[PDB]
Amino acid sequence: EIKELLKLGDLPTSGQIRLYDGRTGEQFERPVTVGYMYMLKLNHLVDDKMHARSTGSYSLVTQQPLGGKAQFGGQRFGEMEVWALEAYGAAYTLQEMLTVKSDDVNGRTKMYKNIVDGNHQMEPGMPESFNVLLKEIRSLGINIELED
Amino acid sequence: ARVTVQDAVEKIGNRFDLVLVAARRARQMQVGGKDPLVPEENDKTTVIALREIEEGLINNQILDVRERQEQQEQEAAEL
Amino acid sequence: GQNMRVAFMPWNGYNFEDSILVSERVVQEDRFTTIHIQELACVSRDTKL
Amino acid sequence: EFDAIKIALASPDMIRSWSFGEVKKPETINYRTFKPERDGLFCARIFGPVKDYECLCGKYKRLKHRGVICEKCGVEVTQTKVRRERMGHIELASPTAHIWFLKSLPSRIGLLLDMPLRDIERVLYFESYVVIEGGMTNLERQQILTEEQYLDALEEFGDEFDAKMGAEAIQALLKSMDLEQECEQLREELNETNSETKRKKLTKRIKLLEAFVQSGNKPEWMILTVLPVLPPDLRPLVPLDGGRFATSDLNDLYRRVINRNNRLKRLLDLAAPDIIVRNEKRMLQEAVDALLDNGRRGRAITGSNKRPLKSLADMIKGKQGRFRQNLLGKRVDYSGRSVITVGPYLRLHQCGLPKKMALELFKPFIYGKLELRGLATTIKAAKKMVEREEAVVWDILDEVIREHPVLLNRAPTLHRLGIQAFEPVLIEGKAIQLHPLVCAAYNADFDGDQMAVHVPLTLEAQLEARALMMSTNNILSPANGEPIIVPSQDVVLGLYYMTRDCVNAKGEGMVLTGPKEAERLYRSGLASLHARVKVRITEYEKDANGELVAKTSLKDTTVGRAILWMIVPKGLPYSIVNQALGKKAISKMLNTCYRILGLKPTVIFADQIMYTGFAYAARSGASVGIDDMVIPEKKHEIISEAEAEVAEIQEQFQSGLVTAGERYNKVIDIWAAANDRVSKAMMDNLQTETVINRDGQEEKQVSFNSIYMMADSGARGSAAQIRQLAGMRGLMAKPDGSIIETPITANFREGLNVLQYFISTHGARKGLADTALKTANSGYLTRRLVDVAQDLVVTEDDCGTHEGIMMTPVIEGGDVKEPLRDRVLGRVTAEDVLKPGTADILVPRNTLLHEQWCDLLEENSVDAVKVRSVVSCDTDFGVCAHCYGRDLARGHIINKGEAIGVIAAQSIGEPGTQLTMRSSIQVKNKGSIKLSNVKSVVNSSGKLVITSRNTELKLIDEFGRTKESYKVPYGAVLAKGDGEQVAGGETVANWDPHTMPVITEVSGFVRFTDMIDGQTITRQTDELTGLSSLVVLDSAERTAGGKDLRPALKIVDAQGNDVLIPGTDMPAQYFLPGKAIVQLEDGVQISSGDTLARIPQITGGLPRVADLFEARRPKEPAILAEISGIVSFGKETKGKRRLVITPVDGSDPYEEMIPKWRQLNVFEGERVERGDVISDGPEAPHDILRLRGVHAVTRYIVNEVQDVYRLQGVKINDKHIEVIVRQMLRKATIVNAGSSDFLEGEQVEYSRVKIANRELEANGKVGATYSRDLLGITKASLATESFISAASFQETTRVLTEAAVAGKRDELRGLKENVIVGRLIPAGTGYAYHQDRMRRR
Amino acid sequence: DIVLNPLGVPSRMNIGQILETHLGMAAKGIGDKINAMLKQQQEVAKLREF
RNA sequence: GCAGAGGUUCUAGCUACACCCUCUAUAAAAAACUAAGGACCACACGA
DNA sequence: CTCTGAATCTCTTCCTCGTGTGGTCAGGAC
DNA sequence: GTCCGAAGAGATTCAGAG
Ligand SMILES: [Mg+2]
C-alpha cells in the first residue's frame, strides 16, 4: 500500500533519492532515504539548562546552592567524582574542589583575591563543612579533637 | 600550545614528579620574576614549564640548583 | 511537533551517535520557535512602620 | 596544623569548657524583634554577636570597641563568624541516658552493666526500679525490681536497701563499678569458663572494659548530665515569607528539651509528688532521646507537619547526612552544566565551550587579565566590563583560555575515565561540544545528556589536569589493555565503506602511483572508492633500535584502502589496512599504533581516523532504506515447515502419545531450530545479496546492503539483532522466564501482530525495569567497593617476597576462556619461571611480563607461572610496586604513589551497567589423559574406574599445555589409563547421572554384617525382574530396633575372613547410606571395581558479584572437613548426624552436626582430605579460605567473579579483583598470643599482628599465630582502624559509638580520611607531600 | 532540513521511523502533486479525480 | 589604608571580600564609585 | 541441664546528579 | 512588655537434648 502510494506520486518506489552533497556538489553514492518524519521538539531546551557559576551564594554549611542549583549555584562535585579524581591522583585538583573552591571560606576569598592578581596560589584551610560536622558530632557528648 | 606530555614524562618517569617540578617551575615563572629559558609563543606558564622540561633543561635537581643559587646570591648581598 | 524533510545518512559526524542536524532552513522559516510564558510573582507584605 | 583526630566521651566538665553559657529560655528570636531572646537557643550573649563588631544593643556599634563585653547588654563585640564556634550547655535537672549507647546495635550499656537491654530500658524509662548497695537484703547491686517489689523490699530494709529509679540509678551503678577490678575478675573467669558462647560474650565485654579503662574516659560519661547545643549559626532560622521565620527542625527539638528541663526544675523547686516527677523525668529522657536520634525508640516525635524531626544523628548518618552530602561531595564553584553534543572539527585534546558559560566560569581570570592590561582599574569596573561583555572581553577570554584545561564530567561517573580534561575552544551556542571518540569512555549518548564542567584554578592544578586529566594522556583504560579511545559507531562504518572491495567498480585494474594518486582519482570521480587496483605504497617498518626502513612495494589493494595509507604514520605495515577494517580491526589498529609508535602518533591517528571516517561516511550515503532489509523468500517456506511440525506434535498430544512437558520441550526445540534455519537463510541471502557482473560471467560477493554494512562492520548492530529485525524474532519468555510455545513468527520489516507485540512487550519491560534497578544496585556496589579499597595506595618499589600466585589459564570444563597470554600480561613473575626442560631459568624471578616475555612463554610451552599478586604482598598500608605489575593504563610499571585501590574498585563496579541481574565425558582434540588427586581402580573388565572425588581429567597436549579439562565423578568408568594419549572428538568417560555406584577395591564374597533385615534394610520387591533388590534403610526412618547398629558390607575371602585395603588395617567394609538400593545378596562373588548399590542424586548476575564480594555464605553451603582422616558417624544421629575425623599421626578431635537433610556424597569409610566437599553445594568463601589458604580463596573468588564478568563479555584484569580481596581479608584472628599481647578471641587487623610478629622475631621470643578472617566488604570497610572512613561509609552511629567508647584515635593515612579533612590525599600528586610529612615526623 | 543518524535504527530497533519516513515522503509527494496542478490553475475536475 | 572621624556626591562610607586622601583627637580644596544573603519533605520527570 | 544451635526481632542501605514544579515550618491569657 | 519489600547482618529468646 505504501509502495503504491509512493508510485502514485512522481516519486521513486524504493523510497531513496540521490542526494547531491551541499558542499562538494557531488553525487552521494548509495542513494539515501529521504522523507518527512514528524519530528517533535522536546521541552528539555538548552537555554534553561545552560548553567555556570563563578562565585555566588553560600549556606550555613557554606555550600553554594545547597538545596537547588537554580539559585545561581555551582555544580555538585558528587560522591563518585572524588573517587574518579583520586583514581588519577589529582590531589591538588581534589584539594581545590573540596577545600578552596567550595568550603574554606577564608581560603576561598583569599584565593579569589589571589586569582584576580594573576597569581594562582592556594591555601588548604579547614573545610567549613568539616567544622560543621565536628561541632555536630561534638554536640552529642562524643568529644572530637584535632589533636596534633 | 601542546597536546601530550609523553616527551615530558619520559625524563621524569614517575608522571607525578613531573607535576610537582613543573608546578614549582611555573610558580617561579609566574609569581616570581624568572623569565622562561625556553622561547615563549603566547603560551601559558604550564605549557612553558612542560617545554622547559622537554628541552632537557628543567628537572628536579636543576630546580634545587636554581633555588640554592638564589639563596647564595641573596645571602651574599646581606653580609 | 512539526514535520520536515529528513534524510538518513552520516553527515560529517555532526549526527555522530544520536544527534540531530537541523538545517538553518528550519530556523529561518520560524518552524520550531516556541513561546514560553514565565511568571514573576511579587507581593506587598504588612511590614512594621 | 595537626596530624590526627581524637575521640572520647565528653565528660560534664569539658562540655562546660566548650559551652559559653547555659541556655535557659526555650524561646528563640522573637517574631517582633529579630534580636534573639535573653538566654534562648539563639542568644548573642552566650553565643556570638548577631553582626560583626556590633553587640546586640547599640551601645558598641562602632568597630573601635574591639574584644570588649558590652556592659549595657552583656554581649561581646566579636566578629559574628564566632556564632559558628560557640556552644551552649543544657544543665539537665537530672542525668539522662545517651541513646547512642542505650537501644543501639553495639549495646555498650548492655555489655558494660552486664544487664539485659530490656531491663536497662525499664529502669531508665522509670518502668521499674534498679537497686544500688542492697547490702544485707537479698537484692544485690545489679537487680531490677517492680514497684510492688520495691514496696516489699522497703519492708525488708527501710533505708540500707536502696533502689534508685531512672537514669540517676544507672549513673550511680556506673559510679559503683570499678573497671580495673572488674576487668581483671572478668579475665579470671574468662580463663576458666570455656563455654564457646560464654567465651564470645565475655571476650566482647572484656574488650569493652579494657578499651574503656585504658582510654581516658570514665563510665559515668555514658549518662549525659549536661547536653551541649549546636552553634546557633549551624542551626538557623531561614525564611522571611509566609510564616516569617520557620524552624530548622532542630530548634524545636532543643526547645522541647529545654522546656522539659525547665518544668522538671520547677517541679524539683516545688517538691511535687514522686509519681508526677517520675512522669516528668521520663518525658525529659524521651525528649533527649528524640534530640539524640528521633526514631531509636517508639513513636518519633513530631509537632511540625506530621514528619519525623531531623535529629542530630539524622544530620550525620545516611546520604543526606553531612558525611556524604556535605563532606565527600561538596558542590563546587567555577562549575557549569549543559546538554552536550558532537563536534568533529574538534581535536582529541579539545572540547566545545559556550562563550556565555565560559565567560561565567573564568570571571576571576577575566578580572585579572583586564586589571593587568589596564582596561579596568577596580573589580567594579571589571565586573561592569564583563557584564556588558565588550568586544575587548572576548579576545581577552580567548587569551586566558590559551592553555587552561577544564574538567568535563558526566553525572553518573563510574570509572576514572568518566572525568577527563580538554583545552576548551570558544564556540557559539549553549552546548558544550564533546569529541566523538571520547564519548565511548564517558558513555556519552548525545540525546540530551548533560555534562558538568569544572575549572582547575591553581597552576599546579591546571598542570595536573594537563598531565593526567587530559584525554590524550589516559587513552589506555585501567580496566583492560584494550584502548578506550576507539572509533565507536559512525567513523567505523565510514572506514568499512572505504576499506572494501566490489569486483566491478569504475576504474578497476588501474595501477596507481601512490596513495596521493588514489585520492586524486577518487576526488575526480574517475575511480570508485572501493575499486580494486595496484598501488605503490612505501611501508616503514622498524627493525632497528628505533629507526625505520623505506620498504617500497606494490600491493593488490582497493582505492579506499589506499586512501587510508596517507593517514597512517610511518611505523605501521600495510596489512593493518589491506583488510575490510571493521570495528575489531580498527580497535586493533589503534592498539598496534599505541604499542609501536608510542602515544603522539596514536592521538594523531584517533583525530585523523575520525576525520576520514566522517568525511567518507558522508560520501558513503550509508542510508537505511526498508528495501535494504531483504526478507528471505526461504523463510516463509521454513515457517510452513515449522507449522506442519508443530501441528504434528500438537495432534500427537491430542492422542496423548506425548506428555505436556514433552510436547512443550519438543515444540520449543522445533521452533528454535526453525528460527536458526530462518537466521541462516536470512544471512545467506543478505551477506551476499550483491550479484555483480565480473567483466563477463556473474559473480557474487559481500553485499552492500546498508543494514548489513552497519551490522557486519561492527558499527552498530549484531547478527542476532539483525536476525530479529529481518528474519524471525525467535521466541521470547513470560515474566518468569518460561518461553511461549507460540513464538513471534513475524518481524519488524513486515507488520507485527497484536499478540506478538504484547509478548515482545513482556521482555521489553522486563529488561527496562531490570536496567533501572541495575543502575541503582550497581551504583551502590561501586560505592561499597571503592569504600572498602579506598586506603590501599602503592607505597614501595618492591616487597621482597618470593610468595606469589600459581596463575594458570582458566579451563572450567570447556576450552580455554582466558589464555595465559592475556592472563599474566603486565604482571611480575613471583619466582624463577623455568621452561619445560628443568634447570633452565627461562624467566628471572623479578621481571615484568610484558609483550615480549609472554610471547616467549607461549612458544616455549608455558602452563603455570607464578606472579607476585597484591594479595601475596606483605607491606603494611598498601601493596608494593612489583606486587601490582603494570598500571595497565600506561605503558610501564605502576608508579610509586598511584591509588590502585580506587581505580580497581571502579573498574570492578563500572561494568555493573553492562552486567544484567534478571551426562558423559567426551574428549575434544589431541592430547593425553592425566589426572591429579586420582584414585583410579582397574576393574576386572580392564577399564578405568576412579574412587577419588576431586579427581580432575585434564587434556594436556603433546607439549604440556592443558587445553581441555573435565571433572571426573565418583566411580566414573574411563576409556583409557592415566597419561594415555587419545584421539580427537572421542568419548572417554561417563557415569550414571543419578547414581553414585559403590565400587569395590578388592574382589571377594560379601557378608551383610550389622545389617538387620526389616529394620536396617528393606527387601523391597523388584517390580520388573522379581528378584528383590535390597534397599538400605536409614537409621532415622527405620524402626526403633536397628537404630543402634549401622549398615555395613564387609568383603570376605574363600575362608570368610576380613579382607582389608593394602596399607590400611581397616577391612574392606562398605557402609551404606539411606535409600541405598543394593541389588545383591551376601556371598555373591563380585570383582575389584564392581558396583554394589544405587542411590538417587544459584544466581548469575549482579547479585552474584554482590554475594561474592560480600562473602555471603550461601543458604545451602557445601560442608568441608577441617582435618584429614577417616570419616565416621560417631553418634546415632541423635538430633543430627556426626562426622569424626581420625588422622593417623595427629589426634582425632572432630564433631560436625551435618543437617540430616543433605546428600552427603562422602560415604562412611573413606579417608577424606582437609578441604573436601562431604556434601555438595556453593562453597562458601570463609571456610574455603580457612581450609585451603589465602592463595586458594583469592583464586576461587577471582575466577568466579571473572566468570560472571566474562559471561557478559566485559574484560577486567584480575589485579582489580585481587586488590579488592586483599582489602577484603586484611583481618586476622589470634590463635596464640605468644610473647606479644593479643587476646585469643580478639579480631585485630592483619597488618598489625604481622608487624608485631616481624618485630618479635627480631629476638628469640615467639610471636603470635593467626588465621586471616575473610570479612564481607560492607563490614570489612567498617572494621578499619581509622574511624572517619567507616563513619562516612555506612552505619555511622555504630562506628561512632564504638570509636567513642574505645577512645579510638584516627591516624588518617588514608584517601577518604584526608578527603574529609581536606588535606592532600596520600595517593597521587600529594603522595610526595605526604611522604615528606611522614618523613618529618 | 534534517539529517538523522542511520546507525540509531539497527541497535535501537525502531524500524517504524523509516516506514514513517517513506510514508511521509509519499504524503508530501501527493501534496506537491496537487500543489503543482493548483499552483498553475487546473480545473476542478482534474484535481477532483486525482 | 587595618584602632576612629571627616571630605566634594546621595542617609551612611572607618579595607566589611570591598574604591581615593589626611592625622592621632582637628573636618575640607577634589573627579571615576557603594550593599558582605540564606532550609526540609512529596511529585513530573531526564542520563 | 546448659549450651551449640534453631528460631525471634530489629536496623541500615539501597547510582548520582541535574531541570525543575509545588508544599511545609511555636496563641491567646494574665 | 513579658511569659507558659528485601536482604542481609547482627543482637537476642526458646528449646531440646545432653
Ligand atoms: Mg544519552
Dihedral, CA of residue D374, residue D379, residue D385 and residue D386, to nearest 10 = 120
D208 close to D179: Cβ distance less than 8 angstroms: no
Asked if residue D395 belongs to a known ligand binding site, the reply is no
Asked if residue D183 belongs to a known ligand binding site, the reply is no
D1310-D1312-D1316 Cα angle (round to 5): 115
Radius of gyration of chain D (CA): 39
Residue D17: other Cβ atoms inside 10 A: 11
Q: Which residues pair with D954 in a beta bridge?
A: D930, D965
- Cβ-Cβ contacts under 8 Å, A39 against chain E: 2
Name the residue with cell 510514508: E23
D146 close to D156: Cβ distance less than 8 angstroms: no
Q: Please, is D852 exposed, middle or buried when counting C-beta atoms within 10 Å of its C-beta (0-12, 13-18, 19+)?
A: exposed
A54 close to D361: Cβ distance less than 8 angstroms: yes
Q: Please, is D74 exposed, middle or buried when counting C-beta atoms within 10 Å of its C-beta (0-12, 13-18, 19+)?
A: middle
For residue A145, the surrounding DSSP H or E stretch is strand A142-145
Name the residue with cell 560464654: D198
Rounded-to-integer distance, Cα D400 and Cα D585, Å: 41
Q: Please, is A74 exposed, middle or buried when counting C-beta atoms within 10 Å of its C-beta (0-12, 13-18, 19+)?
A: buried
D1071 close to D1165: Cβ distance less than 8 angstroms: yes
Which cell goes with D157?
A: 530494709
How near does any CA of chain C get to the CA of A16, in Å?
9
Q: Nearest CA to D18 among E22, A66, A140, A4?
A: A140
Rounded-to-integer distance, Cα D844 and Cα D812, Å: 30
- Cβ-Cβ contacts under 8 Å, E49 against chain A: none
Summary count for chain E: helices (H), strands (E):
2, 1
Q: Nearest CA to D326 among D318, D335, D334, D338?
A: D318
D717 close to E11: Cβ distance less than 8 angstroms: yes
Residue D462: other Cβ atoms inside 10 A: 28
Name the residue with cell 588427586: D933
Q: What is the per-residue burial (b if ≥16 Cβ within 10 Å, else e) of A20-51? A: eeeeeeeebbbbbbbbbbebeeeeeebeeebb
Which cell goes with E47?
A: 484535481
Q: Is D73 helix (H, G, I), strand (E, B) or coil?
A: coil
Residue D263: other Cβ atoms inside 10 A: 16
Cα(D116) to centroid(ligand 1), Å: 56
Name the residue with cell 547414581: D995
The yes or no reply on domain B5-78 and CATH 1.10.645.10 is no
How near does any CA of chain A get to the CA of E3, in Å?
9
**DSSP strands (E only) in E1-50:** 2-4
Name the residue with cell 551497567: D913
Q: Nearest CA to C19 among D475, D429, A29?
A: D429
Rounded-to-integer distance, Cα D229 and Cα D494, Å: 68
Cβ D1275 to strand H below 7 Å: yes
3-state secondary structure D932-998: ECCCEEECCCCCEEECCCCEEEEEECCCCCEEEEEEECCCCEECCCCCEEECCCCEEEECECCECCC
Rounded-to-integer distance, Cα D1168 and Cα D1139, Å: 11
Domain locations in chain B? 5-78
Which residues of chain D (441-460) touch nucleic strand G at CB < 7 A? 450, 452
Amino acid letter for position D874: D
For residue D418, the surrounding DSSP H or E stretch is none
What does residue D191 show for φ and ψ, rounded to 5 degrees? -65, -25
Rounded-to-integer distance, Cα D1035 and Cα D198, Å: 34
Amino acid letter for position D400: V
For residue D223, the surrounding DSSP H or E stretch is none
Q: Give yes or no for C32 touching A (CB within 8 A).
A: yes
D900 close to D1309: Cβ distance less than 8 angstroms: no
Rounded-to-integer distance, Cα D1128 and Cα D1049, Å: 15
D944 contacts: CB under 8 Å, gap ≥ 6: D936, D937, D938, D973, D974, D975, D976, D977, D978
CB contact under 8 A, C16 and E5: yes
D1033 contacts: CB under 8 Å, gap ≥ 6: D1015, D1016, D1017, D1018, D1042, D1074
Which residues of chain D (64-123) touch nucleic strand H at CB < 7 A? 105-107, 110, 116-118
Q: How far is CA D786 from CA A76, D789, D969, in A?
A: 19, 5, 41
Q: Provide DSSP, D803-817.
A: --B----B-SSSS-S
C-alpha of D1095 from chain center: 41
Q: Is D886 helix (H, G, I), strand (E, B) or coil?
A: strand
Cβ D294 to strand G below 7 Å: no
Amino acid letter for position D373: R
Asked if residue D883 belongs to a known ligand binding site, the reply is yes
Residue D672: give its domain's CATH number.
Answer: 1.10.132.30
Q: Nearest CA to A36 among E29, D677, B1?
A: E29
Which cell goes with D572?
A: 605501521
Read off the DSSP letter of residue A27.
B
**DSSP strands (E only) in D207-342:** 224-228, 335-339, 341-342
What does residue A76 show for φ and ψ, rounded to 5 degrees? -95, 110
Q: Nearest CA to D1289 among D1321, D1272, D1311, D1312?
A: D1312
Which cell goes with A33?
A: 532515504
Resolution value in angstroms = 3.7
Q: Which residues pair with D328 in a beta bridge?
A: none
Query: Which of E2, E7, E28 is the closest to C20 by Cβ?
Result: E2
Query: Which of D98, D236, D331 is the closest to A74 by Cβ?
Result: D331
Read off the DSSP letter of residue D1181.
H
**CA torsion sign, D1192 to D1194 to D1195 to D1197?**
positive
Rounded-to-integer distance, Cα A139 and Cα D313, Å: 11
Read off the DSSP letter of residue D84.
G
3-state secondary structure D1247-1314: HHHHHHHHHHCCCCCCCCEEEEECCCHHHHHHHCCCCHHHHHHCCHHHHHHHHHHHCCEECCCCHHHH
Rounded-to-integer distance, Cα D396 and Cα D384, Å: 15
Query: Which of E7, E15, E19 is the closest to D710 by Cβ?
Result: E7
Q: Going by beta carbons, is chain A in contact with chain C, meaning 3 or more pairs sit under 8 Å apart?
A: yes
For residue A143, the surrounding DSSP H or E stretch is strand A142-145
Q: Which residues pair with D1030 in a beta bridge?
A: D1078
Dihedral, CA of residue D602, residue D604, residue D605 and residue D608, to nearest 10 = 170
**Residues with Cβ–ion distance below 5 A, ligand 1:** D 445, 447, 449
C-alpha of E47 from chain center: 18
Q: How far apart are the first and last CA of chain C?
A: 54
How near does any CA of chain A get to the CA of E49, in Å?
13
**Strand H nucleotides within a 7 Å radius of protein CB atoms:** 2, 4, 8-13, 16-18
Half-sphere exposure of D258 (CA within 13 A, CB side): 22
Rounded-to-integer distance, Cα D341 and Cα D351, Å: 10
Which phi-psi region, left, alpha or beta, contains residue D885 (left: φ > 0; alpha: ψ -120 to 50)? left
Amino acid letter for position E50: F
Rounded-to-integer distance, Cα D134 and Cα D159, Å: 9
Which cell goes with E3?
A: 539529517
Q: How far is CA A138 from CA A111, D6, D1132, D1204, in A?
A: 30, 11, 60, 45
D795 contacts: CB under 8 Å, gap ≥ 6: D875, D877, D878, D879, D880, D896, D897, D1327
What does residue C33 show for φ and ψ, rounded to 5 degrees? -60, 135
Q: How far apart are the first and last CA of chain D?
A: 13
Q: In what order do the strands lie in the sheet with E2-4?
A: A16-17, A32-37, C4-8, E2-4
* Alpha-helix residue ranges (DSSP H) falling in D412-509: 439-442, 459-464, 490-498
Amino acid letter for position D167: A
Q: Provide DSSP, D1184-1234.
A: HHHHH-HHHHHHHHHHHHHHHHHTTT----THHHHHHHHHHS-EEEEEE-T
Which cell goes with D700?
A: 557474487
D668 close to D676: Cβ distance less than 8 angstroms: no
Q: Max CA-CA distance within chain E?
A: 50
* Alpha-helix residue ranges (DSSP H) falling in D1112-1154: none
Q: Which domain holds residue A135?
A: 64-148
Q: How far apart are the first and last CA of chain B?
A: 44
Q: What is the per-residue burial (b if ≥16 Cβ within 10 Å, else e) of D516-536? A: ebbbebbeeeebbbbbbbebe
Rounded-to-integer distance, Cα D1097 and Cα D145, Å: 58
Q: Nearest CA to D344 among D428, D434, D451, D473?
A: D434
Q: Is B10 helix (H, G, I), strand (E, B) or coil?
A: coil
Asked if residue D873 belongs to a known ligand binding site, the reply is yes
C45 close to D518: Cβ distance less than 8 angstroms: no
Rounded-to-integer distance, Cα A112 and Cα D574, Å: 55
D730-D731-D736 Cα angle (round to 5): 150
Q: Provide DSSP, A37-90.
A: E-----S--STTT-EEESS----TT--SSSS-TTTT---B--HHHHHHHHTTT-
Strand D951-956 relative to strand D335-339, pairing? unpaired
Rounded-to-integer distance, Cα A16 and Cα A26, Å: 17
Q: Provide DSSP, D718-729.
A: -HHHHHHHHS--
**DSSP strands (E only) in D283-389:** 335-339, 341-342, 350-354
D45 contacts: CB under 8 Å, gap ≥ 6: D21, D38, D39, D56, D73, D74, D75
Q: Which domain holds residue D717?
A: 626-766
Which cell goes with D691?
A: 550479484
Directed axis angle between helix D600-620 and helix D490-498, to 10°? Answer: 70
Q: Provide DSSP, D170-222.
A: HHHHHHH--HHHHHHHHHHHHHH---HHHHHHHHHHHHHHHHHHTTT--GGGG
Rounded-to-integer distance, Cα D361 and Cα A86, Å: 23
Q: Which residues pair with A58 in a beta bridge?
A: none
